[PDB]
């Protein structure tokens, strides 16, 4: 119902909106007498400096640090200093036969990253038929994973296939 004041205040859209002071602040000072508006020590400092400058993205290491002790993570020659930020080598230590370690080179946190690429796929996997079939089963299992995550999903499926390898 009270629409005249609304549209009338909306008319004064351009930059010259200052008389509102003389129209309202006398009445406000009359009814309200608050000395406490912003007397406390305060200053606006939005940003000074924000960057890692010390390590890899925190989310990845923080998440992989809580994985099982069955795995072991370390670093290769540093060919992923800034962008990749991870070049990991994992060796499954459990009640099963081990295998060739993965590459584990990830991308930004969107994670469309099939991090291992099997650089030594051909010979190291044609060495024996058993591990060759193991690799084949792994690859067949990987494609069904929608938007897999190298951090958890990839390694988990790899361990699952390696433990199912005994048929």
């Amino acid at each position: 119902q009270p629409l005249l004041d609304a549209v009338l205040a909306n008319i004064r859209s351009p930059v010259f909106n200052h008389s509102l002071y003389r129209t309202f602040v006398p009445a406000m000072t009359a009814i309200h007498g608050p000395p406490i508006t912003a007397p406390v020590v305060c200053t606006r400092k939005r940003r000074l400096e924000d960057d890692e400058r010390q390590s890899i993205p925190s989310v990845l290491q923080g998440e992989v640090a809580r994985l099982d002790p069955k795995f072991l993570v370390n670093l290769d020659p540093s060919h992923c200093s800034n962008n990749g930020t991870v070049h990991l080598i994992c060796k499954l230590d459990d009640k099963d036969l081990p295998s060739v370690p993965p590459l584990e080179l990830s991308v930004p946190a969107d994670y469309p990253a099939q991090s291992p690429l099997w650089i030594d796929r051909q010979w190291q996997y044609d060495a024996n038929p058993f591990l060759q079939s193991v690799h084949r089963c792994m690859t067949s299992r990987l494609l069904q994973l929608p938007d897999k995550h190298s951090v958890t999903a990839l390694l988990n499926t790899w361990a699952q296939s390696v433990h199912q390898a005994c048929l």
Binding site: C80, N83, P112, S140, L145, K148
Partner: protein, 191 residues
């Protein structure tokens, strides 16, 4: 219609199932060759002329995914299909060469595309081959000068294939035509 072919290709390639939480026991050769045979039968069926736009639809559906493993497995079946004589190269090259490159956007997709281009770089072609060279150089020039420092080998793949072409030009394809293609890139020196 084209939607029928798209649905057929989807059914031949899509294997959407439950999350498979429960461990279940029950494709590189069986399913791949089966999909290849099905797509070959659809090829032999009809729509020979309009298979240009049909393969455009095909590559669109291929790019409609996000799992690099899936896109690689997809590209592989087209690779074997073209190398086995079926689906002559010219069509697939002229289709994939445009509208789906995604310049330095999808490093994985870009990489696999240029790898399959390197594979098909044999590519027996008539005088109408300068066009694809122009397309490659036009896509290259859009790349900036300081994009990054880690994505290199993926970009060298384009450099690799263009070097392969420019060097085999002495023995593979007409050289002078390739030279005349560079005139759109070298106007007496333009960096």
């Amino acid at each position: 219609m084209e939607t029928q072919l798209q649905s057929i290709f989807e059914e031949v390639v899509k294997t959407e199932v439950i999350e498979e939480a429960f461990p279940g026991m029950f494709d590189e050769k069986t399913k791949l060759i089966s999909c290849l045979g099905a797509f070959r039968q659809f090829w032999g069926g009809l729509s020979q002329e309009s298979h240009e736009q049909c393969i455009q639809w095909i590559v669109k559906f291929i790019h409609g995914q996000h799992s690099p493993k899936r896109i690689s497995f997809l590209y592989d079946c087209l690779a074997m299909a073209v190398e086995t004589g079926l689906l002559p190269p010219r069509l697939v090259c002229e289709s994939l060469i445009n509208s789906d490159t995604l310049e330095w956007e999808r490093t994985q997709l870009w990489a696999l595309t240029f790898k399959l281009v390197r594979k098909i770089i044999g590519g027996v072609d008539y005088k109408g081959v300068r066009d694809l060279l122009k397309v490659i150089l036009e896509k290259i020039l859009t790349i900036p000068n300081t994009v990054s420092s880690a994505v290199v080998q993926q970009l060298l793949a384009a450099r690799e294939v263009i070097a392969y072409i420019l060097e085999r030009n002495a023995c593979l394809l007409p050289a002078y035509f390739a030279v005349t293609e560079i005139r759109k890139l070298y106007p007496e020196g333009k960096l």
